[PDB]
Design a protein around this ligand. Structure first.
Ligand code: ADP
Ligand code: ALF
Ligand code: MG
Lengths: 113, 393, 99, 165, 186, 111, 113
C-alpha cells in the first residue's frame, strides 16, 4: 500500500540523470489520482453509481486498474524504471488532461499518449 | 468488627414508607432490605438520605458521615433539632444517632465510622426496633482500605482496591435484615441499609458499585443528566430496580384492596415505551408518531414531571402518604384509559389535548394537595369523564 | 398499460366514465375498493376531497408506492385545503420554511 | 455503546469505522441538502399548478334524459432523476380539456411525494448516524483507550513488585 | 475472550504457516466451521493452488482467488454498508452481495454431524465452486444486459436451491452438480 | 439468550429414539432465522420499519414471537418435548418453504 | 454556561439582607427561560425555524440576549447585586406574564417593567 508508505529520501533518488525528468511529477500525480479514485469508488457504495459523474467513473476505473495492473505485478516480475513510468502514463491516460494538474504541460505534452 | 448475635433472620416483606414517590411506588425498599444509591457528583445521593433520615417509618436512624463534607454534617445538627414531628412533638434529633468522620479527617477512621454505626444499629435492633443505617459514603471507606492496602504492601485486585473488598462489603450488608432478636421474647428487630456509592465519573463498573449490587436487592441508580434538568430526585427509572417490587406488590395490593401492582406495571409499561419512542422521535420526528403513540408520550410525560419529580425543600411535595400516591397514580392512569377510549372512537390526538387543557393542569398541581384534602385528586377522575364526554360529542 | 380509477359522488365524476375510467361511487368501503384496484396495477386513482377525508389512513399508506398515484380532485361543492394541506405539510416537514 | 471486547486490534478497527462513518454522514447530508434543492423548485411549481387546476377544475365542476345519454369512447414511463424513480356540451368540452390537465397534475404531484419519501429515508439515515452510530463509537473509543492504559499501568506495577522478590 | 493478541497466539503465528482463526459471531449464528475468512490465512495457498491447477487441469488457483476476492469485496461493502444501509446499493454491487451469501451458506457452511457434509472430495469441491463462480460470472453478463436486479433472482430461485443442496450430492452422483452450469446460463 | 448459549453433548442425545427424529433440523433452522430476525429488529429500530426489506420484515415478526411465546414461558411451566418441537415448527411455518434451507425436503414434507 | 454550573449553598446567600428579595424568584425563572430557550434554539437548527411555534421563537430570541447581554459583561466590568438583578428583570419583560409561572404575582407587579 503506497498511501501509508513514504520514503524520506526519494527526492534525491528521482530526477534527471537519476531516472527521468518525469519521475517526481508522475509520482505526485498518480498519488493524488489514487486517493481520489478510491474515494470515488466508495461514493458509488454510499451514494450509488448515479451520483458518480463522467469524471468520477474514470477515477473509479483508475484505482481499480492501478490496484490490479500497477502494484499487482508479481513476485517474479522485474520492471525497469522505463517500463514503470510508462505504465503510470497509460493508467493516467484514462483521465483527461484537466484531471492531471500536478504535471506541467511542458512534460505532459511529452509523454502522454 | 463482629456483628451482634440474633436467633434467625427473616424475609423483609414489609415495604418501608419513605414518602418519596419514585421510591415507594416503583423501586420500594423493604424494612430490613439493602439499598445502594450510586451516583456521580452532585446527583443527589446525600439529599435522598436526608429525606429518608426524616420521613421514614423507623424507630431510629443511624447516619454515618463516612468521608463526606464537613458542611454536610453541620447542616444535620442544625436542621434536625428543628424537624419536629407534629404528632409526638419530639424532634428528629431525638430519634437519631449520627457518626461523622469527614474527608479531611483521618483516613483510617473512615472504616471505624462504618462499623461503629452498624454496631449501634444492631444494639437497638435487638430491642425489637426497626433501625435504619445510613452510610454516606461507602466509597470513602473503600478508599481507606485501598489506602491501607498500599501501606501494607498487599497485592491489589481491581483498580487498586484490596482483594478482600468483596468480603468486607458482604460482611457488612449481611449484618442487616429483619431478624428475630435474642432472648425468650422472640421479638422482631430489623436493620435497613441505605448506603451511598460515589463512583469516579459516575461509572458504575467500578469495583465497589458492582460488589454492592451483588449483595443488595435495591439499586437506586442516580443519573447526572436528570440532576442537570432539575429532575429531582434524580432516580433513573430505566436502570434502577428493586427485587422487592413483586413481594411489595402482593403486600401493597392487599392493604389498598386495589390492583396496585397492575397500575405500577402499567405505569412502568408507559415509561419503557417512552424510551423506545424517544429513539424514533430523534430519528424520524414527533410529528411522525401516531395518535395513540403520541398519547403514550404525553401520558408518560405526566408520569415524569407530576409523579416522579419531587422537590426536597418544598413542604407540599417533600412527603407523600401511601393513600395520596394511589389517588395520584389513578388519576394519571385514568387519563390515558379514557383517552384511548376516545381515539378508538374516532377522536383525534390534538382534539383531546386542546380540549383537556384545563384538566391537564389539575394533575400537575396534584402533588401539592394536602393530606386532609385528598378528595380533590379522586374527584378529577370523575371530572375527566365529564370533560371527555363533551369532547367526544 | 395501466387503468385509471375515479372515486367521488355521482354528479361530480360521472363524465370521467366516457373516456374509459373505472368510476366508482363510508370509510371501510372505499378502503377495500381502492386497495383492490391498487392490487390490480392501477395507474392513477383520482378521488374527491370529500371521500378522501374519510380514509386518510389508506392514502397515507398508499402514497408511498410509486406505481399507483392517488390524486385529490374537487367536487361540485369545492375543497377546503386538501391539496394545499398535503402539499404544505410535505414542505414544512421536509424543507424547513414555507414558500 | 456497542458491546465489544477491549483490545488494541478492536481499537484500530473501530477507529477506521468511525472515520468512514463520519465521511458517510457528510455525504448523506449532502444528498439531503441536494434533494432539498430540486424538491424546492419542483414543489413551488406544483403548488402553483395545483392551486390553478384545483379552482379551475371546480369551476368546471361548478358549471356542470341525462342518464340515458351517458351509457354508450374508451381511450406512465419510469425515469430516474438522481436517486429517485419518477413516473412519466360546453361542460363536456371543459372535461376533455381538463383530462390532459389532470394527467400532468398526476405525474407531477406523485413525483413530489416520491421526492419527499426519499428525502425522509435519507433524513433518518443521516439522523441515526449523528445520534446513534457515531456517538456509540465515540464513547466506545473512550472506554477502549481507558482500559488499555490502566491495564498496562497496573501490569508494570506488579512487575516492579515481582522484581523485588 | 477470543483475544488473539495474547502471547500464546502471537508467538504461535510467528512459527506456524496456517492460521484457522475461529470466530464467535459466526459460531453463535450456527455457521460452521466458524472460520473467519477475512481473518484466517495460509502461507501454503500459493503452492497448493499450483498443484490443484495440475491435478484436475483447471485454473483453480485463480478461481479460488476470485472467491476470496468476492468474500473480500463483501467485507468492504458490508463495512461501508452496515451504517449507511444498502438501499442505495447499485444493481451490480447487489449481485456481489448475493454471490457472497451463496459462497457463505452453500460452501463454507457445513455440518460435521450430517454424514454427507462431513467429507467433500476434490471433484465435489470443484463442481460446487464451478456452479457458484460461473453463476456470478455469467449472471454478471445478465445484469449487464440492461437487467434490473430484482428480476434475475426471482427467475432463478429453482437454480439457486439446487445450488444450496450441492454439498448433499453423493460422490457417485456428481453429474448433478456439474449440470447446474448449463441451467444457470439458460 | 439462546444465541450465545450452546450445548456440546446434545447431538448424541437427540434424534429418533431419544426425542424426535427432526429435532436437529428444526433446531439448526431456528437459530439461523432468529439471528437474522434479531438482526433485522435491531435495524427496524434504527432505520425504520418501512426501510426494512419485506422478506426481512417477515423475519422481524419471526423473532418477536420467538421471544414472547417460545422463550417466555414462565418459571412454573413444564412443557413437554413434543409440545416444544411442535411449537418450533409453528414458528418456522411463517417463513416460506424456500427460506428453510437447512431442513431437508424429507423433514420439510413430513412437518 | 449556567446549565451545567451549580451553587449548592446559594440559599444561604439569597433573600432579604443577603440579596434583593427578588433574588430567589428571578434566578429560577431566568434558568427555566434559558433552558427552554436553548432547547428552542437547538430545534431551529435540526428541524428548521418552521417547526417551532411563536412562543418557541421568543424563548430562542431571549437566549440570544441572555448570553450576549446578561452573561457577556466583560472581564473588567464589575456589576453590583442591584445592577445584576435589574438587568435580569429587564430581560424577563420579553416573556409574557403568563409564562413567568415560577414568580408569584406579588413580585411580578412590583419589579416587572
Ligand atoms: N430530591 C431532591 N430535590 C431537590 N433538589 C435536589 C434533590 N436531590 C438533589 N438535589 C439538588 O442537588 C444538589 C446536590 O445533592 P446531593 O445529594 O448533595 O448530591 P450528591 O449526589 O453529591 O450527594 C443539592 O444541592 C440539591 O439542590
Ligand atoms: F456532592 Al457528592 F457525592 F458529589 F456527596
Ligand atoms: Mg453527598
Amino acid at each position: 500500500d503506497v498511501l501509508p508508505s513514504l520514503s524520506r529520501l526519494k527526492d534525491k533518488g528521482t530526477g534527471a540523470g537519476k531516472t527521468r525528468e518525469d519521475h517526481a511529477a508522475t509520482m505526485n500525480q498518480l498519488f493524488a489520482a489514487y486517493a481520489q479514485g478510491k474515494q470515488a469508488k466508495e461514493l458509488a457504495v454510499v451514494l450509488g453509481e448515479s451520483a458518480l459523474s463522467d469524471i468520477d467513473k474514470i477515477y473509479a476505473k483508475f484505482a481499480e486498474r492501478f490496484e490490479n495492473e500497477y502494484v499487482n505485478q508479481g513476485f517474479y516480475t522485474n520492471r525497469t524504471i522505463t517500463e514503470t513510468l510508462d505504465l503510470g502514463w497509460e493508467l493516467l491516460a484514462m483521465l483527461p488532461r484537466t484531471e492531471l494538474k500536478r504535471i506541467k504541460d511542458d512534460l505532459l505534452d511529452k509523454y502522454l499518449p | 468488627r463482629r456483628g451482634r448475635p440474633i436467633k434467625q433472620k427473616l424475609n423483609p416483606d414489609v415495604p418501608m414508607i419513605t414518602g418519596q414517590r419514585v421510591i415507594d411506588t416503583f423501586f420500594p425498599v423493604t424494612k430490613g432490605g439493602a439499598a445502594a444509591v450510586p451516583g456521580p457528583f452532585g446527583a443527589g445521593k446525600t439529599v435522598v438520605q436526608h429525606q429518608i433520615a426524616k420521613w421514614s417509618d423507623v424507630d431510629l436512624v443511624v447516619y454515618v458521615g463516612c468521608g463526606e463534607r464537613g458542611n454536610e454534617m453541620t447542616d444535620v445538627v442544625n436542621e434536625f433539632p428543628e424537624l419536629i414531628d407534629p404528632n409526638t412533638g419530639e424532634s428528629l434529633m431525638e430519634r437519631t444517632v449520627l457518626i461523622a468522620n469527614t474527608s479531611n479527617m483521618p483516613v483510617a477512621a473512615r472504616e471505624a465510622s462504618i462499623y461503629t454505626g452498624i454496631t449501634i444499629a444492631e444494639y437497638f435492633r435487638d430491642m425489637g426496633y426497626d433501625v435504619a443505617i445510613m452510610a454516606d459514603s461507602t466509597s470513602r471507606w473503600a478508599e481507606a482500605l485501598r489506602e491501607m492496602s498500599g501501606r501494607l504492601e498487599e497485592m491489589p485486585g481491581d483498580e487498586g482496591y484490596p482483594a478482600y473488598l468483596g468480603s468486607r462489603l458482604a460482611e457488612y450488608y449481611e449484618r442487616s435484615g429483619r431478624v428475630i432478636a435474642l432472648g425468650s421474647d422472640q421479638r422482631e428487630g430489623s436493620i435497613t441499609a441505605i448506603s451511598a456509592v460515589s463512583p469516579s465519573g459516575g461509572d458504575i463498573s467500578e469495583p465497589v458499585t458492582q460488589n454492592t449490587l451483588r449483595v443488595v436487592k435495591v439499586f437506586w441508580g442516580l443519573d447526572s443528566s436528570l440532576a442537570q434538568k432539575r429532575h429531582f430526585p434524580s432516580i433513573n427509572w430505566i436502570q434502577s430496580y428493586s427485587l422487592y417490587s413483586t413481594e411489595v406488590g402482593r403486600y401493597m395490593d392487599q392493604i389498598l384492596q386495589q390492583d396496585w401492582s397492575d397500575m405500577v406495571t402499567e405505569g412502568m409499561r408507559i415509561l419503557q415505551e417512552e424510551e423506545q419512542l424517544n429513539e424514533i422521535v430523534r430519528l424520524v420526528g414527533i410529528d411522525s408518531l401516531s395518535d395513540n403513540d403520541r398519547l403514550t408520550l404525553e401520558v408518560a410525560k405526566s408520569i415524569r414531571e407530576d409523579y416522579l419529580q419531587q422537590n426536597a425543600f418544598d413542604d407540599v411535595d417533600t412527603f407523600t402518604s401511601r393513600e395520596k400516591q394511589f389517588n395520584m397514580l389513578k388519576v394519571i392512569l385514568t387519563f390515558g384509559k379514557e383517552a384511548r377510549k376516545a381515539l378508538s372512537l374516532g377522536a383525534y390526538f390534538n382534539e383531546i389535548m386542546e380540549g383537556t387543557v384545563a384538566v391537564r393542569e389539575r394533575i400537575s398541581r396534584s402533588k401539592y394537595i394536602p393530606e386532609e384534602e385528598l378528595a380533590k385528586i379522586s374527584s378529577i377522575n370523575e371530572e375527566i369523564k365529564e370533560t371527555i364526554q363533551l369532547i367526544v360529542s | 398499460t395501466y387503468k385509471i380509477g375515479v372515486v367521488g359522488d355521482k354528479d361530480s365524476v360521472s363524465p370521467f366514465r366516457l373516456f374509459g375510467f373505472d368510476v366508482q361511487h363510508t370509510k371501510t368501503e372505499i378502503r377495500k375498493t381502492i386497495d383492490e384496484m391498487a392490487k390490480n396495477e392501477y395507474g392513477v386513482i383520482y378521488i374527491t376531497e370529500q371521500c378522501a377525508n374519510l380514509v386518510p389512513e389508506t392514502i397515507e399508506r398508499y402514497k408511498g408506492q410509486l406505481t399507483p398515484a392517488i390524486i385529490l380532485i374537487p367536487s361540485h361543492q369545492g375543497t377546503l385545503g386538501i391539496g394545499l394541506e398535503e402539499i404544505q405539510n410535505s414542505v414544512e416537514k421536509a424543507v424547513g420554511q414555507n414558500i | 455503546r456497542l458491546n465489544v471486547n477491549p483490545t488494541r486490534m478492536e481499537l484500530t478497527r473501530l477507529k477506521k469505522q468511525l472515520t468512514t462513518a463520519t465521511r458517510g454522514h457528510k455525504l448523506l447530508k449532502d444528498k439531503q441538502d441536494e434533494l432539498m434543492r430540486q424538491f424546492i423548485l419542483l414543489i413551488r411549481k406544483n403548488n402553483e399548478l395545483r392551486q390553478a387546476i384545483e379552482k379551475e377544475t371546480q369551476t368546471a365542476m361548478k358549471d356542470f334524459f341525462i342518464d340515458e345519454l351517458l351509457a354508450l369512447e374508451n381511450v406512465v414511463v419510469e425515469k430516474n432523476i438522481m436517486s429517485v424513480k419518477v413516473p412519466l356540451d360546453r361542460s363536456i368540452d371543459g372535461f376533455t380539456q381538463l383530462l390532459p390537465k389532470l394527467l400532468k397534475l398526476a405525474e407531477v404531484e406523485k413525483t413530489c411525494q416520491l421526492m419527499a419519501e426519499e428525502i425522509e429515508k435519507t433524513r433518518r439515515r443521516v439522523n441515526a448516524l449523528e445520534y446513534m452510530t457515531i456517538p456509540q463509537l465515540e464513547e466506545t473509543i473512550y472506554y477502549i483507550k481507558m482500559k488499555l492504559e490502566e491495564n498496562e499501568r497496573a501490569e508494570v506495577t506488579r512487575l516492579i513488585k515481582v522484581k523485588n522478590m
